[PDB]
Design a protein around this ligand. Structure first.
Ligand SMILES: *[C@@H]1O[C@H](CO)[C@@H](O)[C@H](O)[C@H]1NC(C)=O
Ligand SMILES: *[C@@H]1O[C@H](CO)[C@@H](O)[C@H](O)[C@H]1NC(C)=O
Ligand SMILES: *[C@@H]1O[C@H](CO)[C@@H](O)[C@H](O)[C@H]1NC(C)=O
Ligand SMILES: *[C@@H]1O[C@H](CO)[C@@H](O)[C@H](O)[C@H]1NC(C)=O
Lengths: 49, 180, 68, 98
């Protein structure tokens, strides 16, 4: 959660990185990762669903 | 290109050399300018001009001929965001473009370098051939000119330019004027 | 007394700059452009058989869209 | 000065205009995936091989022409000196005029 609304020109992933929430799998994980990285921001706007 | 408008070193009395080009000829790339008792004249060398032009046009034809023909190809512009496959296509096209740009740059640089080198080589070859025709009758000036120590009339100059020149029939007087 | 025979080459009032392996900018009497950087702005219809999809994508024509 | 200028010019040509690249395909994989991963590997390997060959050829050509132009400068200087010594001198053959 420390990465909320963060922005980057280069996101550096560490080999020690781990997941500590509900187990999840992303079909086409690479595509989502690549497009999010190319976007360069995690700027999240909440919407009134 | 080495232009020579303002006589570049001397007055009209003594002019013409290899260190500087001539704008006063249009009939050939290479040529001669001569002064003698009969007056002054200029002419062009068709042999070296034709050889150089042939080489230049040949390399141009090599460069331009055999154009590649391509009909169906990957999509190179995308209106969507898709990720892995689209990024791969973009990377492939960018790699091809960069490699071909580098190839064009290197090819043009090499071709220009060798064009200049071969033209200078043709000029030096012509000068060397003229110098070896003037076996001993003449003496090299260092500015691209030969001083002929005899009465080398317009017929003499024509023989030198066209290759029928005979050194011996002037050798005695040329040497006598050189050393005495 | 003597004659003078000078050898030389043609030059032009102002040539064109070119790149080389040695010199980054050197003048030459004549040069040609090897990059086609301009377009006619129109698609010639020959010799290739051009088919204009005015208001139709290829898939719409394939399926048989009424306006295709 | 002429030779040094040419050498530095070719060096600047070689080094200047560095390509800038920001986002690219993945080139290291922790999984086995088959067709797409093999295609990515092949693309990257092809690029690497082509650029390695280009670097090899470029360096060879540049070194060859550097040596050739330096020798040409030396010969040009010798020729110019020889033509200055129109007849006062006589060439020794070892690079010297008497
Ligand atoms: C992130 O930025 C958006 C505006 O772009 C804002 O609405 C939102 O509250 C921000 N979130 C945090 C955690 O600061
Ligand atoms: C070369 O020039 C000399 C001198 O005018 C002339 O006698 C001779 O016929 C010429 N040769 C040719 C092949 O034109
Ligand atoms: C040719 O024209 C260009 C125009 O910028 C120039 O600066 C250069 O000095 C010119 N050379 C000659 C010989 O006129
Ligand atoms: C320059 O070269 C081109 C291509 O060979 C040729 O068509 C053109 O006539 C040349 N121009 C001059 C002034 O020599």
């Amino acid at each position: 959660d420390v990465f909320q609304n963060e922005t980057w020109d280069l996101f550096v992933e560490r080999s020690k990185a781990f997941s500590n929430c509900y187990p999840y799998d992303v079909p086409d994980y690479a595509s989502l990762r690549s497009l999010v990285a190319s976007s360069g921001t995690l700027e999240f706007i909440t919407e009134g669903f | 290109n080495v232009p020579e408008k303002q006589t570049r070193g001397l007055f009209g009395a003594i002019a013409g050399f290899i260190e500087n080009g001539w704008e006063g000829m249009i009939d050939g790339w290479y040529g001669f300018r001569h002064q003698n008792s009969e007056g002054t004249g200029q002419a062009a060398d068709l042999k070296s001009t034709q050889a150089a032009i042939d080489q230049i046009n040949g390399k141009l034809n090599r460069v331009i001929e055999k154009t590649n023909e391509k009909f169906h190809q990957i999509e190179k512009e995308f209106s969507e965001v898709e990720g892995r496959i689209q990024d791969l296509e973009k990377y492939v096209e960018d790699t091809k473009i960069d490699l071909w740009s580098y190839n064009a740059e290197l090819l043009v640089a090499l071709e220009n370098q060798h064009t200049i080198d071969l033209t200078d080589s043709e000029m030096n070859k012509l000068f060397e051939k003229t110098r070896r025709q003037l076996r001993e009758n003449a003496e090299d000036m260092g500015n691209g000119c030969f001083k002929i120590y005899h009465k080398c009339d317009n017929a003499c100059i024509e023989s030198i330019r066209n290759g029928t020149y005979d050194h011996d029939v002037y050798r005695d007087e040329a040497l006598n004027n050189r050393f005495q | 007394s003597t004659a003078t025979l000078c050898l030389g080459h043609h030059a032009v009032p102002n040539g064109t700059l070119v790149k080389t392996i040695t010199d980054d900018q050197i003048e030459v009497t004549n040069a040609t452009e090897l990059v086609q950087s301009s377009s006619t702005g129109k698609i010639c219809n020959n010799p290739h058989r051009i088919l204009d999809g005015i208001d139709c994508t290829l898939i719409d024509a394939l399926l048989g869209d009424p306006h295709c």
